[PDB]
Amino acid sequence: EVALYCNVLVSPDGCVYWLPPAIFRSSCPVSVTFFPFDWQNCSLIFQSQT
Amino acid sequence: SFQISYSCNVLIYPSGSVYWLPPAIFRSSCPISVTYFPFDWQNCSLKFSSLKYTTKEITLSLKQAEEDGRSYPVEWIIIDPEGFTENGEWEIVHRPARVNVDPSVPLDSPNRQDVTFYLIIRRKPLFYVINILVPCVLISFMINLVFYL
Amino acid sequence: DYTGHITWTPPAIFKSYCEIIVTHFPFDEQNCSMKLGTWTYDGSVVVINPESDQPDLSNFMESGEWVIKESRGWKHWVFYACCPSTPYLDITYHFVMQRLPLYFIVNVIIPCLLFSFLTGLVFYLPTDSGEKMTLSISVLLSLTVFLLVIVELIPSTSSAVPLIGKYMLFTMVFVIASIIITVIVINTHHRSPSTHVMPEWVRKVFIDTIPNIMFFST
Amino acid sequence: PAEEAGHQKVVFYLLIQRKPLFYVINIIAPCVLISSVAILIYFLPAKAGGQKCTVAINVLLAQTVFLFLVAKKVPETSQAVPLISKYLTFLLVVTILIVV
Amino acid sequence: MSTKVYLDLEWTDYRLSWDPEEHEGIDSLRISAESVWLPDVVLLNNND
Amino acid sequence: LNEEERLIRHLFEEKAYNKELRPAAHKESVEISLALTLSNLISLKEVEET
Amino acid sequence: GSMICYNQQSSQPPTTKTCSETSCYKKTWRDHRGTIIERGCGCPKVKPGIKLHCCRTDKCNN
């Protein structure tokens, strides 16, 4: 989950804006073949839990 | 971390008895004697008491179990023999359990009564014998070879 | 659901205790289990059943260090002598896994092999070079410094001696024996008539019995 | 399955290149230099006082110190051998051959 | 410096007084700390 | 649920259970029996003395 | 060659099975909840702290 549960901004049309900040530690499988001259392809997968 | 880890359900019975088995992960202070390292043994303790209530409010005692209709106090730490996995470096030699009441502190102190479970544990020196001690001794005894050079 | 069916799929980080057998390290196979059960409910009030015989590995990320060869889940009924009407149920999911040994092959076994190869090289170096002891003692010093690498990289468990640890101790003893034998050879090489008299058995063995096989001058 | 929860995903990718300057300055170039020292023993005399074996084996000792230095920095997976580990093993083997 | 200590805080709350003879001799109570007014005593020079 | 809910409603609503009060007279002590089961011994850290 | 062993748990109603081994075993231990008795075939190697009774007779583990 997100780090801070800030306020949402509700507009007269009912459209809700939310900008919470987050500290995320995500899983990045490190390809080690060319270490320390390597490059990595890390991923951040966001989805609904429920 | 004074408290138990998982606050599970209590079991109550028609007699009014309440049974509670909370599990806990505890980090306690065990002073280390290094005199005979790596052939040393340590004496650690787990001291359980109530900081909310005194001896006037609660009375601590060991569990009373029964064998063949005769009751006895459980004066030891219970270890399930079938399910227990021994620690990688520490063998357990003694597991006593005591109820300690010291008269030095005042009676209105919650620290007057406690139940202490002790672990006397011997180090298994195999790692240190193999990796450090034997090479150290064998290199140190080569100092006698310069007299033949 | 409208029928009262509840599905609950929470995540968790499971830190489980597992008997680790380091006898064959780094080529070891482990079998680690997760026993799950209702803590305060026995089988007579809550019945737990496994969803499948096997744990679900469909969303399993490939591990960096281990390969899971086998996985299964077993339900266990436990009865106690005091109560013969109330079982205690558990479900134990076990995983049999194999370590990938490439890291320890590259970083521990190969330098030990190279030092073991270097150990026997001092016996081709002539004593007149004045470098036999330098070579042997420096091989020992390199092994001693590599002990830092090994104490950093290898688990500190006393349940068993790792196979790689046996290789280490063998190489250490090998180098020490090389040093002792080199001291003996060097002592032999500066034996002089003013200090020593050649025994007859040394002349019988090391001059005629063996060198006749070799190609030099008695 | 449309009724299951987590199947529509928004995935953000980060393709990141490592800046290797620390490893070049502190590990790779000193190791290259110390290993190239061992090539100099072919110009020392082959007699007492030339000190070929001293130089070669002390270079190997320095390389073992470097093994300890990199041992605390390389990842510990086992699909592939790192490039730095391959190079250090190669330098070790070269020093072994120089000693031979 | 990491220490394990027991504080000892004494004060007087005039609102929590009673006559013991009107309550069957009860002269002391053990009340959860969240239920009473506490002084806001903190360690000012904590490092964490 | 019927007898379980009935018993809970009898013990905690009809009888007005108070968890803040000890189950004893004011001058009496409650006997607590304690036992310990060692599930597993994780570690003894020598430097941190723990 | 065959044998009849018992295999029930603890104080459950007795059951029996056919052991192809030359011994039947009773295995007794005590966890925090109570005493467990396991009956079966052979003479297994038990962990320390477990009572074991091996016997070479029909219906001998009870």
Side-chain angles (χ1 to χ4, degrees), chain C residues 14 36 53 63 103 108 114 123 127 132 144 152 193 196 205 211:
Chain C
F14 276 3
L36 297 155
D53 288 338
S63 174
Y103 178 66
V108 177
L114 295 172
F123 298 110
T127 307
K132 259 162 131 68
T144 303
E152 182 85 353
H196 287 73
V205 175

Side-chain angles (χ1 to χ4, degrees), chain C residues 39 77-81 84 88, chain G residues 9-12 31 33 35-36:
Chain C
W39 191 250
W77 295 254
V78 177
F79 287 99
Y80 292 93
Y88 286 87
Chain G
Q9 291 184 46
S10 296
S11 311
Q12 293 290 285
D31 74 16
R33 267 193 287 242
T35 301
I36 296 166

Side-chain angles (χ1 to χ4, degrees), chain B residues 23-98:
Chain B
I25 293 160
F26 280 136
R27 278 144 201 107
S28 64
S29 63
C30 186
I32 304 284
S33 177
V34 297
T35 303
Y36 298 113
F37 182 87
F39 306 96
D40 58 310
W41 57 271
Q42 308 301 331
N43 188 7
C44 310
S45 64
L46 299 164
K47 192 216 209 179
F48 286 98
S49 64
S50 179
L51 293 174
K52 260 184 146 241
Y53 295 119
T54 59
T55 293
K56 273 168 38 46
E57 278 93 23
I58 61 167
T59 301
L60 297 174
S61 64
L62 294 172
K63 183 210 200 348
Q64 309 253 303
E66 283 203 296
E67 153 170 294
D68 282 343
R70 263 202 299 171
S71 56
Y72 56 99
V74 176
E75 290 227 76
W76 43 85
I77 299 164
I78 295 165
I79 291 169
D80 170 35
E82 193 32 52
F84 190 72
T85 302
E86 265 265 296
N87 190 271
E89 152 169 84
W90 294 102
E91 166 187 7
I92 295 166
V93 177
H94 301 299
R95 303 126 41 184
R98 273 182 162 189

